[PDB]
Amino acid sequence: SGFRKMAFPSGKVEGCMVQVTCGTTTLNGLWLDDVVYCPRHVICTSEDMLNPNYEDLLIRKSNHNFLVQAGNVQLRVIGHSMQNCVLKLKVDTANPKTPKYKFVRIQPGQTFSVLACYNGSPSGVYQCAMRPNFTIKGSFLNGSCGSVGFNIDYDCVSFCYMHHMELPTGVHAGTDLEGNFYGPFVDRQTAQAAGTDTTITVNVLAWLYAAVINGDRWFLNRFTTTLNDFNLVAMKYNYEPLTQDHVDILGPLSAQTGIAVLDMCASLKELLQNGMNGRTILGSALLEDEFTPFDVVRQCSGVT
Amino acid sequence: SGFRKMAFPSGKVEGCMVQVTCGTTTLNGLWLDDVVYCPRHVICTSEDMLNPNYEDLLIRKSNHNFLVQAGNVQLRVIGHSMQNCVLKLKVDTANPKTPKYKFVRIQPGQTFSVLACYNGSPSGVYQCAMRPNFTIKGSFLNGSCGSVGFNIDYDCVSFCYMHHMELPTGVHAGTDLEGNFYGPFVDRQTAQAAGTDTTITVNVLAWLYAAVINGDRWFLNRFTTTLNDFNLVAMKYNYEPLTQDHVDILGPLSAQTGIAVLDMCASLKELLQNGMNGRTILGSALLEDEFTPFDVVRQCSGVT
Numbered sequence: 304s305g306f307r308k309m310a311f312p313s314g315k316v317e318g319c320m321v322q323v324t325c326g327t328t329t330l331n332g333l334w335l336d337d338v339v340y341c342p343r344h345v346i347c348t349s350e351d352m353l354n355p356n357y358e359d360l361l362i363r364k365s366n367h368n369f370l371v372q373a374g375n376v377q378l379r380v381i382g383h384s385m386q387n388c389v390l391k392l393k394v395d396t397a398n399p400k401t402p403k404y405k406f407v408r409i410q411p412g413q414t415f416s417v418l419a420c421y422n423g424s425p426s427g428v429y430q431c432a433m434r435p436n437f438t439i440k441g442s443f444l445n446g447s448c449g450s451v452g453f454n455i456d457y458d459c460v461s462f463c464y465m466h467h468m469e470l471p472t473g474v475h476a477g478t479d480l481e482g483n484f485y486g487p488f489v490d491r492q493t494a495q496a497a498g499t500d501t502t503i504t505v506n507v508l509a510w511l512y513a514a515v516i517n518g519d520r521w522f523l524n525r526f527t528t529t530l531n532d533f534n535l536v537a538m539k540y541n542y543e544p545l546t547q548d549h550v551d552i553l554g555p556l557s558a559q560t561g562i563a564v565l566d567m568c569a570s571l572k573e574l575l576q577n578g579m580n581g582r583t584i585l586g587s588a589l590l591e592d593e594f595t596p597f598d599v600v601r602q603c604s605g606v607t
Numbered sequence: 608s609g610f611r612k613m614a615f616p617s618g619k620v621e622g623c624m625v626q627v628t629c630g631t632t633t634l635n636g637l638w639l640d641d642v643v644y645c646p647r648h649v650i651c652t653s654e655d656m657l658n659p660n661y662e663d664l665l666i667r668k669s670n671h672n673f674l675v676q677a678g679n680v681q682l683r684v685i686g687h688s689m690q691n692c693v694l695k696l697k698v699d700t701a702n703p704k705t706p707k708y709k710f711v712r713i714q715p716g717q718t719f720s721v722l723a724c725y726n727g728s729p730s731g732v733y734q735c736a737m738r739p740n741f742t743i744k745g746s747f748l749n750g751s752c753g754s755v756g757f758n759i760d761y762d763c764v765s766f767c768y769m770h771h772m773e774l775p776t777g778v779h780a781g782t783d784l785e786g787n788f789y790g791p792f793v794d795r796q797t798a799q800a801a802g803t804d805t806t807i808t809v810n811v812l813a814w815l816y817a818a819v820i821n822g823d824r825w826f827l828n829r830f831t832t833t834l835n836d837f838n839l840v841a842m843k844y845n846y847e848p849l850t851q852d853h854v855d856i857l858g859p860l861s862a863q864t865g866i867a868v869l870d871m872c873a874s875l876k877e878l879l880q881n882g883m884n885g886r887t888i889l890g891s892a893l894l895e896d897e898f899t900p901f902d903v904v905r906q907c908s909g910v911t
């Protein structure tokens with residue numbers, strides 16, 4: 304019993320973290336095989352940050368200008384190239400700690416673990432969700448760029464995120480491991496609009512199922528609703544519309560608890576319209592949306 | 608910017624997790640040097656669980672009855688002994704992945720990371736606080752016993768907790784790495800009273816300082832209070848009394864923010880007496896107490 308915001312064990316990713324220095328800027332790199340991946344803004348100066356011409360800036364850089372250090376050993380850079388907003392630094396040594404890995408572009412609403420790093424060294428690990436507006440509510444300081452987000456499937460690490468930026472609003476933006484930003488964000492020190500961030504309904508429902516499995520059942524009511532009636536309430540409260548796909552993914556949790564999805568939707572409807580009245584659910588006084596139905600099943604069944 | 612419930616990177620601890628089987632029971636063990644540490648209730652049968660005579664049960668067990676497996680390789684047990692509620696299984700091979708480590712008995716109110724494990728394999732990592740009533744609000748299932756709690760100081764892992772039990776109330780109990788239970792708990796399947804759990808005031812204040820540093824300043828008021836006046840409010844709301852030591856530890860956060868500790872106490876007093884009025888602080892609708900002043904400074908300064 305118990306329900307926590309659980310991150311994946313970070314060991315396989317710690318063995319990939321390196322420090323990348325270019326000129327006077329230092330950030331984090333991800334060493335997989337003979338390649339180090341890092342944000343391309345490592346080549347910027349504090350003058351270039353407002354609107355950098357990365358192609359021009361990279362042209363003034365040679366392999367010897369990229370200092371890559373893993374622990375205390377220097378890696379020799381034999382190639383460099385820009386792929387979207389990431390630089391791929393080819394090194395002469397394959398990382399002996401390279402785990403079985405994939406590069407995946409996650410969907411909004413999906414979750415992942417972040418290993419925050421500074422100077423190539425891991426400082427902490429936390430669980431995040433890619434918001435519907437493609438930002439993440441992380442915890443990042445100067446030098447955190449190049450820290451990665453990931454998921455683990457037994458022995459395989461799926462890298463989904465690389466940290467690039469913090470918007471003036473305190474929210475975080477970044478790319479997949481091919482350098483494509485999640486959302487409309489660009490890697491330049493400018494004010495950028497993060498759109499309206501909605502609540503991930505399927506995750507709030509999955510977390511209501513986790514609450515039911517872990518003893519918290521006060522919010523359960525004698526009501527039911529329809530997809531269309533529930534969605535009228537979800538629209539008013541800036542919640543993602545629930546689809547039949549979402550109902551289907553909630554199927555295992557519905558079967559385990561014996562509470563139909565639309566019955567849980569009716570409980571959520573009343574929680575939105577009436578609030579919590581000073582009560583809590585799984586130790587929280589608000590509706591949590593950073594646990595997918597997969598996260599709930601995994602935490603409530605103990606998948607290692 | 609940003610503030611998350613951040614766990615330590617778990618790699619150094621993952622390299623220590625083993626599976627320990629005795630008879631038909633399997634749980635987790637911690638392999639450091641040539642010793643595997645695990646809960647002694649690994650030697651219990653489902654008949655023994657209500658009141659086991661561990662000394663008698665251990666006497667019917669020999670080295671060959673303890674099956675220790677690290678990954679897929681079997682370790683050879685050359686010695687066994689009970690130290691309080693843990694068994695120390697001497698193996699013929701020192702763990703090549705043994706990190707620099709210490710065994711520490713943490714204080715109530717202090718925090719630590721848990722690497723939840725099943726069958727010697729890590730499933731997840733989360734941050735916990737040792738409650739003033741010596742329980743932890745973890746996330747643990749069958750087979751999770753032997754999972755450890757820890758802190759890291761650069762390269763040194765301080766092991767502070769080993770998971771043993773879940774009380775009928777859904778809260779968790781366990782020992783330090785010498786087998787001494789935190790609290791009055793005993794390792795037997797009986798109803799055990801977890802005392803009244805108070806709120807860790809110094810941590811709630813540290814988290815109010817984290818909120819101020821991260822833009823959330825709505826709760827700041829034009830008031831001040833005294834230690835004795837604040838403590839009259841802390842008593843009424845089941846909060847730990849604030850001491851001058853707590854004020855001193857809050858010193859760096861007070862200096863960084865320019866808000867005196869007693870001024871922050873006055874804000875907390877009003878938050879307790881008036882509630883949140885539907886607002887949030889660092890994304891939470893309740894007062895968070897699982898971040899020590901050290902955790903706040905570390906997360907807000909980026910210590911790796």
Ligand SMILES: O=C(c1cc(=O)[nH]c2ccccc12)N1CCN(c2ccccc2F)CC1
Nearest residue numbers: 344443444445446447468469490491492608
């Ligand atoms: O390391 C950071 C940073 C990241 C973060 O998430 N939070 C912070 C909080 C306080 C100070 C700095 C940061 N940055 C340097 C590189 N920055 C950059 C972006 C685009 C183009 C050039 C650039 F140099 C983004 C900012």
Ligand SMILES: O=C(c1cc(=O)[nH]c2ccccc12)N1CCN(c2ccccc2F)CC1
Nearest residue numbers: 304648747748749750751772773794795796
């Ligand atoms: O693995 C667990 C367990 C631990 C947990 O924290 N949560 C659970 C939730 C559901 C089912 C089991 C658990 N237990 C087996 C060993 N138990 C035990 C304690 C004292 C004496 C003998 C014993 F066998 C404690 C219970």
